[PDB]
Design a protein around this ligand. Sequence first.
Ligand code: MG
Ligand code: MG
Ligand code: MG
Ligand code: MG
Ligand code: MG
Ligand code: MG
Ligand code: MG
Ligand code: MG
Ligand code: MG
Ligand code: MG
Ligand code: MG
Ligand code: MG
Ligand code: MG
Ligand code: MG
Ligand code: MG
Ligand code: MG
Ligand code: MG
Ligand code: MG
Ligand code: MG
Ligand code: MG
Ligand code: MG
Ligand code: MG
Ligand code: MG
Ligand code: MG
Ligand code: MG
Ligand code: MG
Ligand code: MG
Ligand code: MG
Ligand code: MG
Ligand code: MG
Ligand code: MG
Ligand code: MG
Ligand code: MG
Ligand code: MG
Ligand code: MG
Ligand code: MG
Ligand code: MG
Ligand code: MG
Ligand code: MG
Ligand code: MG
Ligand code: MG
Ligand code: MG
Ligand code: MG
Ligand code: MG
Ligand code: MG
Ligand code: MG
Ligand code: MG
Ligand code: MG
Ligand code: MG
Ligand code: MG
Ligand code: MG
Ligand code: MG
Ligand code: MG
Ligand code: MG
Ligand code: MG
Ligand code: MG
Ligand code: MG
Ligand code: MG
Ligand code: MG
Ligand code: MG
Ligand code: MG
Ligand code: MG
Ligand code: MG
Ligand code: MG
Ligand code: MG
Ligand code: MG
Ligand code: MG
Ligand code: MG
Ligand code: MG
Ligand code: MG
Ligand code: MG
Ligand code: MG
Ligand code: MG
Ligand code: MG
Ligand code: MG
Ligand code: MG
Ligand code: MG
Ligand code: MG
Ligand code: MG
Ligand code: MG
Ligand code: MG
Ligand code: MG
Ligand code: MG
Ligand code: MG
Ligand code: MG
Ligand code: MG
Ligand code: MG
Ligand code: MG
Ligand code: MG
Ligand code: MG
Ligand code: MG
Ligand code: MG
Ligand code: MG
Ligand code: MG
Ligand code: MG
Ligand code: MG
Ligand code: MG
Ligand code: MG
Ligand code: MG
Ligand code: MG
Ligand code: MG
Ligand code: MG
Ligand code: MG
Ligand code: MG
Ligand code: MG
Ligand code: MG
Ligand code: MG
Ligand code: MG
Ligand code: MG
Ligand code: MG
Ligand code: MG
Ligand code: MG
Ligand code: MG
Ligand code: MG
Ligand code: MG
Ligand code: MG
Ligand code: MG
Ligand code: MG
Ligand code: MG
Ligand code: MG
Ligand code: MG
Ligand code: MG
Ligand code: MG
Ligand code: MG
Ligand code: MG
Ligand code: MG
Ligand code: MG
Ligand code: MG
Ligand code: MG
Ligand code: MG
Ligand code: MG
Ligand code: MG
Ligand code: MG
Lengths: 122, 137, 10
Amino acid sequence: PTINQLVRKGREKVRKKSKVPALKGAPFRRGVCTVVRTVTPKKPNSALRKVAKVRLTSGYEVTAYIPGEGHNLQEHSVVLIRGGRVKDLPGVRYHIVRGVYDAAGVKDRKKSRSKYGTKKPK
Amino acid sequence: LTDPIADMLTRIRNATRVYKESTDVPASRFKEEILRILAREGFIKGYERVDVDGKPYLRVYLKYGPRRQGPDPRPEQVIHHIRRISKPGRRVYVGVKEIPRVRRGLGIAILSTSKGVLTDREARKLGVGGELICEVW
Amino acid sequence: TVXPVXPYVX
RNA sequence: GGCUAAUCCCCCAUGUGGACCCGCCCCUUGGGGUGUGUCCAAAGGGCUUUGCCCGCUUCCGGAUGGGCCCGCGUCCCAUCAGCUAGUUGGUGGGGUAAUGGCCCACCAAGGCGACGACGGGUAGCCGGUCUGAGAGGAUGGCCGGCCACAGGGGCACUGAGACACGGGCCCCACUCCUCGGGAGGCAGCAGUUAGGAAUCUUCCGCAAUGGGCGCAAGCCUGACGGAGCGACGCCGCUUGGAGGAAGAAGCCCUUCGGGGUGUAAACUCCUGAACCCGGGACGAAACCCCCGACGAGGGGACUGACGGUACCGGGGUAAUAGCGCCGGCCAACUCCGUGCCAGCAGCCGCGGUAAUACGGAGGGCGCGAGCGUUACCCGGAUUCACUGGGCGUAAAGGGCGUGUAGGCGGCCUGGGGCGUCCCAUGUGAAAGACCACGGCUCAACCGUGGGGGAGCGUGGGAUACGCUCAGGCUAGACGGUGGGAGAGGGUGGUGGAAUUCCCGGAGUAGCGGUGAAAUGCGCAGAUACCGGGAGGAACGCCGAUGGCGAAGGCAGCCACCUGGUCCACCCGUGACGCUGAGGCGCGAAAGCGUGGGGAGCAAACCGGAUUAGAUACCCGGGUAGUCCACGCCCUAAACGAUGCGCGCUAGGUCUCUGGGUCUCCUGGGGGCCGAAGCUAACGCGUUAAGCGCGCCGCCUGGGGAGUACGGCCGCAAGGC
RNA sequence: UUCCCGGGCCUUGUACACACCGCCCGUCACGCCAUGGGAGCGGGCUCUACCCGAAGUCGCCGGGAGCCUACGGGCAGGCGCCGAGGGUAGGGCCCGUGACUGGGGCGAAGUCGUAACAAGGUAGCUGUACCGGAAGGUGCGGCUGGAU
RNA sequence: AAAUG
Ligand SMILES: [Mg+2]
Ligand SMILES: [Mg+2]
Ligand SMILES: [Mg+2]
Ligand SMILES: [Mg+2]
Ligand SMILES: [Mg+2]
Ligand SMILES: [Mg+2]
Ligand SMILES: [Mg+2]
Ligand SMILES: [Mg+2]
Ligand SMILES: [Mg+2]
Ligand SMILES: [Mg+2]
Ligand SMILES: [Mg+2]
Ligand SMILES: [Mg+2]
Ligand SMILES: [Mg+2]
Ligand SMILES: [Mg+2]
Ligand SMILES: [Mg+2]
Ligand SMILES: [Mg+2]
Ligand SMILES: [Mg+2]
Ligand SMILES: [Mg+2]
Ligand SMILES: [Mg+2]
Ligand SMILES: [Mg+2]
Ligand SMILES: [Mg+2]
Ligand SMILES: [Mg+2]
Ligand SMILES: [Mg+2]
Ligand SMILES: [Mg+2]
Ligand SMILES: [Mg+2]
Ligand SMILES: [Mg+2]
Ligand SMILES: [Mg+2]
Ligand SMILES: [Mg+2]
Ligand SMILES: [Mg+2]
Ligand SMILES: [Mg+2]
Ligand SMILES: [Mg+2]
Ligand SMILES: [Mg+2]
Ligand SMILES: [Mg+2]
Ligand SMILES: [Mg+2]
Ligand SMILES: [Mg+2]
Ligand SMILES: [Mg+2]
Ligand SMILES: [Mg+2]
Ligand SMILES: [Mg+2]
Ligand SMILES: [Mg+2]
Ligand SMILES: [Mg+2]
Ligand SMILES: [Mg+2]
Ligand SMILES: [Mg+2]
Ligand SMILES: [Mg+2]
Ligand SMILES: [Mg+2]
Ligand SMILES: [Mg+2]
Ligand SMILES: [Mg+2]
Ligand SMILES: [Mg+2]
Ligand SMILES: [Mg+2]
Ligand SMILES: [Mg+2]
Ligand SMILES: [Mg+2]
Ligand SMILES: [Mg+2]
Ligand SMILES: [Mg+2]
Ligand SMILES: [Mg+2]
Ligand SMILES: [Mg+2]
Ligand SMILES: [Mg+2]
Ligand SMILES: [Mg+2]
Ligand SMILES: [Mg+2]
Ligand SMILES: [Mg+2]
Ligand SMILES: [Mg+2]
Ligand SMILES: [Mg+2]
Ligand SMILES: [Mg+2]
Ligand SMILES: [Mg+2]
Ligand SMILES: [Mg+2]
Ligand SMILES: [Mg+2]
Ligand SMILES: [Mg+2]
Ligand SMILES: [Mg+2]
Ligand SMILES: [Mg+2]
Ligand SMILES: [Mg+2]
Ligand SMILES: [Mg+2]
Ligand SMILES: [Mg+2]
Ligand SMILES: [Mg+2]
Ligand SMILES: [Mg+2]
Ligand SMILES: [Mg+2]
Ligand SMILES: [Mg+2]
Ligand SMILES: [Mg+2]
Ligand SMILES: [Mg+2]
Ligand SMILES: [Mg+2]
Ligand SMILES: [Mg+2]
Ligand SMILES: [Mg+2]
Ligand SMILES: [Mg+2]
Ligand SMILES: [Mg+2]
Ligand SMILES: [Mg+2]
Ligand SMILES: [Mg+2]
Ligand SMILES: [Mg+2]
Ligand SMILES: [Mg+2]
Ligand SMILES: [Mg+2]
Ligand SMILES: [Mg+2]
Ligand SMILES: [Mg+2]
Ligand SMILES: [Mg+2]
Ligand SMILES: [Mg+2]
Ligand SMILES: [Mg+2]
Ligand SMILES: [Mg+2]
Ligand SMILES: [Mg+2]
Ligand SMILES: [Mg+2]
Ligand SMILES: [Mg+2]
Ligand SMILES: [Mg+2]
Ligand SMILES: [Mg+2]
Ligand SMILES: [Mg+2]
Ligand SMILES: [Mg+2]
Ligand SMILES: [Mg+2]
Ligand SMILES: [Mg+2]
Ligand SMILES: [Mg+2]
Ligand SMILES: [Mg+2]
Ligand SMILES: [Mg+2]
Ligand SMILES: [Mg+2]
Ligand SMILES: [Mg+2]
Ligand SMILES: [Mg+2]
Ligand SMILES: [Mg+2]
Ligand SMILES: [Mg+2]
Ligand SMILES: [Mg+2]
Ligand SMILES: [Mg+2]
Ligand SMILES: [Mg+2]
Ligand SMILES: [Mg+2]
Ligand SMILES: [Mg+2]
Ligand SMILES: [Mg+2]
Ligand SMILES: [Mg+2]
Ligand SMILES: [Mg+2]
Ligand SMILES: [Mg+2]
Ligand SMILES: [Mg+2]
Ligand SMILES: [Mg+2]
Ligand SMILES: [Mg+2]
Ligand SMILES: [Mg+2]
Ligand SMILES: [Mg+2]
Ligand SMILES: [Mg+2]
Ligand SMILES: [Mg+2]
Ligand SMILES: [Mg+2]
Ligand SMILES: [Mg+2]
Ligand SMILES: [Mg+2]
Ligand SMILES: [Mg+2]
Ligand SMILES: [Mg+2]
Ligand SMILES: [Mg+2]
Ligand SMILES: [Mg+2]
Ligand SMILES: [Mg+2]
């Protein structure tokens, strides 16, 4: 572009699209599970992954992943969630934070237990 | 022809790259003052006022390096690089403290000032700034 | 946001 | 309903002075100074008491705190393009400390906007803070500066100052107290509650600093000075230090020999966080008292919330470790379990029985009172590119002109000095940053100095380049005179070849068509042949790799109107130029409207074949349309997928059209191969995609999607 | 040596490279997500005209009439302009939501054919037009990013 | 002429 054109139209500053829309600014956000089921993932994986349809405090509803092996999460379980998606499960854009509200820690977990909300063992 | 000064600079730049002995440009007392620095700082042997078909020109006598060995005998250049700074589209002016150092002293910056056409070296001495005309090395 | 009877509403 | 004081209120006086009207002098917006008329002041209280102290009154200047006005700077959407009746200006007035349409009457018809008015969305702004090589981006919490608000709104009272957080009125919503209504306003300091992912003690003191009132002792101060909770952040410190086996057990690996944790431990000595005991602050010397004078000055005393705390001494116990990771980026490797399950995941990707990628374990790496995760900002992103990118084929040149604004612009001489450049000078608070010193045992934090800069006001200076005014020039540009080539454009006229149908003649058994066939046509006389008519549309040979046009596009021949353009001569004008958002015009085919026209051809449509099918390909039919006039539509592989003008950088060869001396030289077009150079390559290369300047248009991952919504255009189709 | 099966060398096209037993297109059936449209319904903001109108400053009155006096005056009191807001009516922008509907994205070891990439078996692509279960076909003109 | 994996 000529310099003149730049004086005229100027450069267009790029904008940023949040990948975590429902959070509405906040770091984490509280909610209740409406559905708790398993979803098969996209190719080339095969599994029955653990998810919850969750109703936010912003009166939103997101699909959120349940980490760990096994869970105490059910319909009507009050839960806390955090950002970050699960690439193989489209539409899952948030993770459940284990060890908060009616979300337990992973029983028998010994490695990297901060992530899985398990208190330090024997 | 919108910028006479760039033309000249480019006439030269174009000329050195096939290694013409010389090349003429249309005459101007300001084109001279610049050409003057170009020779006195040794980027050229020199120049002389001429005429073609009654038309004032400034024939510029070009300067080059020693022939080289290897698969490509073509010599190095005296003027490796000469390019406009200030342009009619965007005028460029520096103040004294803002006057740049070309290739770490190894080359010059011509600039038009209220005290004539000078080099970067020259301006910082006379303590002035001006329209930064171009950079050469 | 009304659920089957949960005192939690959302 | 009545009594009474004062620094409360009023009248007369006094008048240094001041206010006002009018004249005049200086000045120059309503600044000073005069003259005459007239108009205005006042408050006393104290002690030791022929005197000083706090008050009061009018005026003048200073100082500090302000009000108002102006220049420039300040976010996203143009899918917001028009906005405005106090609106813009004038006249007179009201109002104020004061200018002003601030308010009013009247008069004129103005004011604003692509340099983005109006409208919508978002935001208190700056010093600064964060990041960044910088340029820039992001941000404005704490502290300092200004503004704005005090439940939601309107108002004015008092006053130097308010239209007043803990003052007043009125309306609203809400809550509260027990029938007339009276009540409230934590966005002060704590505290409650709701909301939330989350955000503190209903602490201590006026000792310090600082504020109000007071002659003064002193009173008030949830400003403040301290303390409390919270690893929230940074900074300091600890859980030990020296010795200790060719090396305990346990656990992990193994080639069964061994290898690892690991000097690690155990065990030895030495130290001595915590804790006890004692002493124990700086922060605090002023006001006050005393001499002198209640001044200068010298001397007295008083008071510490934090606090029995820091800190300084005496004793003195070995005294918490966790978190993340170990496929690649990326530092850290091995067993078992599992078997596309369970699971990991930031991206590429791991798991299907031998997984360094899942879960445990041994071991290892990395940081450590922390380690990680989520969110957001800058970075890497030269991925909005000023520094510092691009568009033939990767995303990207507008289908083509003409031109408004704008941006940009040859040579020479001078005037101004606007940009530009130098110097002086003012400003640029403090804190923060930077360098140096210094104070808490260092540090964090804190003091004291030093360096300042951008930017703007002012004064001086310079004049190359940009600007501007003024003078000349001929190289750009445009004309004159003469001459050229050409399917350039418009109207009209008109010539032959062929297809078809019709008439006539002659003739007979098939013609047609395909891969092969069939449908079709044919004894009602087809085809093939001869003659004559009618009619529409396209112009063979010339014909080319050619020519013309800005593009679309233009082809028999003629005449007429008419554009572009090349050449020669070197006559004329003297920079009159280049580009060009909008605007306007043109714009193949198809399609649309109203009339014509309709031979050949041919979407749709029928039929015959093929085929599993055959809504196709092939064959026999055939309607729009193709043609003309006028009006629309405005698309494209509208392509050189290459915007336009200029300057500059080897040539070789083919060709079209000009001028020359005609071997050839010289212009303008069209091709090919190629110097230098470019390019990711392919390729480009004086017809640049090379080297440069000017201006415009455009790109910023794929899909969604040239879709939706809005808006404009259109009869519609549909276009932008 | 035309054909069928396989092979050698040169060359050309390619969207193949799991290498033609390759790739790949559209409808239709199912599941999930987001969006447009939709008789409407709910809200937020906003503009115009008019009715009523508190407190309050400003202005007129202060008289059949009260109080004060400093009475050519003041105060009470009365009228008026404007005025928070309230009300009626009609517009503009934004958000939410809606029976139903349109296509879109993803999902997948479904159903149909095979449009495109080799001359892809009718060269392709294109603007437009008409037609068709679907890819697509055909007409007109255009491009080579096609022929070998 | 002649489909698919
Ligand atoms: Mg799989
Ligand atoms: Mg897999
Ligand atoms: Mg861990
Ligand atoms: Mg008395
Ligand atoms: Mg008096
Ligand atoms: Mg008026
Ligand atoms: Mg006036
Ligand atoms: Mg006035
Ligand atoms: Mg006004
Ligand atoms: Mg009028
Ligand atoms: Mg706001
Ligand atoms: Mg604000
Ligand atoms: Mg950047
Ligand atoms: Mg702040
Ligand atoms: Mg602040
Ligand atoms: Mg308010
Ligand atoms: Mg208020
Ligand atoms: Mg409130
Ligand atoms: Mg209020
Ligand atoms: Mg006062
Ligand atoms: Mg107040
Ligand atoms: Mg108030
Ligand atoms: Mg205020
Ligand atoms: Mg209050
Ligand atoms: Mg209260
Ligand atoms: Mg509070
Ligand atoms: Mg609290
Ligand atoms: Mg809560
Ligand atoms: Mg605090
Ligand atoms: Mg005090
Ligand atoms: Mg004090
Ligand atoms: Mg207190
Ligand atoms: Mg701490
Ligand atoms: Mg040791
Ligand atoms: Mg050994
Ligand atoms: Mg060992
Ligand atoms: Mg051992
Ligand atoms: Mg083994
Ligand atoms: Mg051992
Ligand atoms: Mg002290
Ligand atoms: Mg005395
Ligand atoms: Mg003690
Ligand atoms: Mg001790
Ligand atoms: Mg001991
Ligand atoms: Mg020990
Ligand atoms: Mg880590
Ligand atoms: Mg690392
Ligand atoms: Mg490694
Ligand atoms: Mg298992
Ligand atoms: Mg892991
Ligand atoms: Mg395996
Ligand atoms: Mg294994
Ligand atoms: Mg592992
Ligand atoms: Mg890993
Ligand atoms: Mg630390
Ligand atoms: Mg980033
Ligand atoms: Mg950078
Ligand atoms: Mg650039
Ligand atoms: Mg790029
Ligand atoms: Mg294009
Ligand atoms: Mg167009
Ligand atoms: Mg112009
Ligand atoms: Mg100009
Ligand atoms: Mg110029
Ligand atoms: Mg100047
Ligand atoms: Mg400062
Ligand atoms: Mg020190
Ligand atoms: Mg300092
Ligand atoms: Mg002139
Ligand atoms: Mg002529
Ligand atoms: Mg016919
Ligand atoms: Mg006949
Ligand atoms: Mg002609
Ligand atoms: Mg002449
Ligand atoms: Mg002349
Ligand atoms: Mg033009
Ligand atoms: Mg057209
Ligand atoms: Mg047509
Ligand atoms: Mg039609
Ligand atoms: Mg028609
Ligand atoms: Mg017709
Ligand atoms: Mg048929
Ligand atoms: Mg057919
Ligand atoms: Mg046919
Ligand atoms: Mg036919
Ligand atoms: Mg017909
Ligand atoms: Mg072409
Ligand atoms: Mg392209
Ligand atoms: Mg153009
Ligand atoms: Mg073009
Ligand atoms: Mg041409
Ligand atoms: Mg040529
Ligand atoms: Mg030629
Ligand atoms: Mg070439
Ligand atoms: Mg080369
Ligand atoms: Mg050439
Ligand atoms: Mg050439
Ligand atoms: Mg290129
Ligand atoms: Mg990008
Ligand atoms: Mg995208
Ligand atoms: Mg996209
Ligand atoms: Mg379209
Ligand atoms: Mg559209
Ligand atoms: Mg629309
Ligand atoms: Mg129609
Ligand atoms: Mg149409
Ligand atoms: Mg377009
Ligand atoms: Mg063979
Ligand atoms: Mg052989
Ligand atoms: Mg081959
Ligand atoms: Mg190949
Ligand atoms: Mg829907
Ligand atoms: Mg909808
Ligand atoms: Mg009414
Ligand atoms: Mg009214
Ligand atoms: Mg009276
Ligand atoms: Mg009103
Ligand atoms: Mg109203
Ligand atoms: Mg009301
Ligand atoms: Mg809606
Ligand atoms: Mg709706
Ligand atoms: Mg096809
Ligand atoms: Mg095909
Ligand atoms: Mg086929
Ligand atoms: Mg084909
Ligand atoms: Mg093809
Ligand atoms: Mg077509
Ligand atoms: Mg058809
Ligand atoms: Mg069917
Ligand atoms: Mg065709
Ligand atoms: Mg090809
Ligand atoms: Mg196949
Ligand atoms: Mg099939």
